[PDB]
């Protein structure tokens, strides 16, 4: 069910970086990884906590939809793009941590967690600051835990309505052709050692959809543009896009 491939590593080791990359065949519900610990590993999600977070604040109402405006709140942050207004669209595609930490406020502690827990999210553990926890608190999750999240939510499965979960694989749109289809959501996790980048989605073909999860070490902001490189390697090698 569960296969180990340990050539993959030479993406990984060629770029002098080490990680996990973690593919999930639908039509043939097997499983394929370069490292069968590592994908087992729990890490902080931060900005792939957006997925889970954005099903939650639709849900409830506390965003409208993918049109609503939030305003920046004029207060200069270090990223150009997080100082201007955004929707739903805009802070998916840009990680605006703010808009997604107001989100978190006022969807609050109790219905976060329990959220979560319908969810199967992880560790499912917000211990932290409810405006922070997903980058410094006490939240947890796998690269195989990714995917199994990715994949309930691919159908629909998610406790929270159809309507929220189109809107949100709308917003983890990523990249299309006329070969494929990508959906999905970085991450950059740099509070918590060991400092890792994220990159979890899917590809949807023809006849078939592909889930994947990856991390990998991240030392620096240097290397943030492997996430892709890395995992378009994988799925080349394994002839899932040309
Ligand atoms: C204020 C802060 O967060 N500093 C910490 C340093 C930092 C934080 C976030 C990004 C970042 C932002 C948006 C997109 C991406 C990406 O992965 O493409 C990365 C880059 C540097």
């Given at each position: 069910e569960w296969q180990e491939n340990k050539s993959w590593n030479a993406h990984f080791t060629e770029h002098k970086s080490q990680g996990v990359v973690v593919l999930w065949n639908e039509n043939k519900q097997q499983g394929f990884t370069n490292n069968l610990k590592r994908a087992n590993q729990a890490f902080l999600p931060a900005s792939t906590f957006k997925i889970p977070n954005s099903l939650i604040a639709l849900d409830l109402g506390v965003?409208?939809?993918?049109?609503?405006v939030f305003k920046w709140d004029g207060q200069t942050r270090d990223?150009?793009?997080?100082?201007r207004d955004h929707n739903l669209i805009t802070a998916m595609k840009y990680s605006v941590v703010p808009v997604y930490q107001e989100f978190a406020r006022q969807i609050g502690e109790a219905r976060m967690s329990k959220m979560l827990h319908a969810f199967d999210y992880g560790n499912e553990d917000i211990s932290?600051?409810?405006?922070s926890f997903w980058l410094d608190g006490g939240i947890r999750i796998s690269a195989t835990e990714q995917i199994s999240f990715l994949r309930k939510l691919y159908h629909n499965?998610?406790?929270?309505?159809e309507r929220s979960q189109r809107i949100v694989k709308q917003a983890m749109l990523t990249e299309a052709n006329g070969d494929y289809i990508i959906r999905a959501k970085t991450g950059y996790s740099t509070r918590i050692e060991p400092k890792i980048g994220w990159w979890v989605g899917w590809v949807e073909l023809d006849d078939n959809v592909w889930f994947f999860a990856m991390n990998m070490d991240m030392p620096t902001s240097d290397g943030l543009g492997l996430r892709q490189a890395i995992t378009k390697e994988v799925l080349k090698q394994e002839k899932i896009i040309p």
């Open positions: 965003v409208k939809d993918e049109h609503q990223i150009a793009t997080w100082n932290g600051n409810v405006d499965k998610l406790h929270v309505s």
